[PDB]
């Protein structure tokens, strides 16, 4: 039932089928990509990240059917990302996660042929030039997305806040209030990053993202990660299907340059 409104990660509506209704899927700046450190170039002009995330900005966590979405109030300017490869202020809007059916392959971006267990995406939009996320999403400099790798390790106290809510949003469409979320404390201690021009990794797959992938991963226990696979990509009352995997395969680099803020 693949369509312009119905897409997913299953056999009939997975990534390979996305181009059927979203032509840009075969574009020149698609994400994710494989980051080959041998091909990465240090750029001293890249600046450190300057981040401020107000714990009260988070408002709701819901099951979109494609992942869990923690939505933030982006009508105010309390949580913003500056610095890095960015010009101007990018306002925090959403946080979601990508994983795979097994712990050995779940991240979207790949590093030197290796897949981490999962990958967190923190979505921001240029509020200096655009009136809202929608208009920013259609501009090359419109979005800034921080990517954070998750690797299996000791239980993560910060991620636990999210896992504690999963049973309440098991079905697609379910939502529960989620605030007092210290997102900054979820990020790794080192803010060193790789950056390149890309796109949303889910339809509409718009090429408006300046990707900022942090080098240092954070840990998550196998049990915590398994909790995400217990979510359904289907709603209450519909035939059940678990969201066992929700990551897109690596896309052609097409001559793009991946830069490092560290050396
Ligand atoms: Zn994402």
UniProtKB/Swiss-Prot annotation:
Catalysed reaction equations from the record: hydrogencarbonate + H(+) = CO2 + H2O
Entry-linked Gene3D superfamilies: Alpha carbonic anhydrase
GO MF terms, alphabetically ordered: carbonate dehydratase activity; zinc ion binding
UniProt xrefs under SUPFAM superfamilies: Carbonic anhydrase (SSF51069)
GO cellular component: cytoplasm; cytosol; intracellular membrane-bounded organelle; myelin sheath
Top-level EC class as recorded in UniProt: lyase
The family this protein is said to belong to: Belongs to the alpha-carbonic anhydrase family.
Protein name, as recorded: Carbonic anhydrase 13
Designated gene of the protein: CA13
């Amino acid at each position: 039932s693949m369509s312009r409104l119905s897409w997913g990660y299953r056999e009939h509506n997975g990534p390979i089928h996305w181009k059927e209704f979203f032509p840009i899927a075969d574009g020149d700046q698609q994400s994710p990509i494989e980051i080959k450190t041998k091909e990465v170039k240090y750029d001293s002009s890249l600046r450190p990240l300057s981040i401020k995330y107000d714990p009260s900005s988070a408002k709701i966590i819901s099951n979109s059917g494609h992942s869990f979405n923690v939505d933030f109030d982006d009508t105010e300017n309390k949580s913003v990302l500056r610095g890095g490869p960015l010009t101007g202020s990018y306002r925090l809007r959403q946080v979601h996660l990508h994983w795979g059916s097994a712990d050995d392959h779940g991240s979207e971006h790949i590093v030197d042929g290796v897949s981490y267990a999962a990958e967190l995406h923190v979505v921001h939009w240029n509020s200096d030039k655009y009136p809202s996320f929608v208009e920013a999403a259609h501009e090359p400099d419109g979005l800034a997305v921080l990517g954070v790798f998750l690797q299996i390790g000791e239980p993560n106290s910060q991620l636990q806040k999210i896992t504690d809510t999963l049973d309440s949003i098991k079905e697609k469409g379910k939502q529960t209030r989620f605030t007092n979320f210290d997102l900054l404390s979820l990020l790794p201690p080192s803010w060193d990053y790789w950056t390149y021009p890309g796109s949303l990794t889910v339809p509409p797959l718009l090429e408006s993202v300046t990707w900022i992938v942090l080098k240092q991963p954070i840990n998550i226990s196998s049990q915590q990660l398994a909790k995400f696979r217990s979510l359904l990509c289907t709603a209450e009352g519909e035939a059940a299907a678990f969201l066992v995997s929700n990551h897109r395969p690596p896309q052609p680099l097409k001559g793009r340059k991946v830069r490092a803020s560290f050396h």
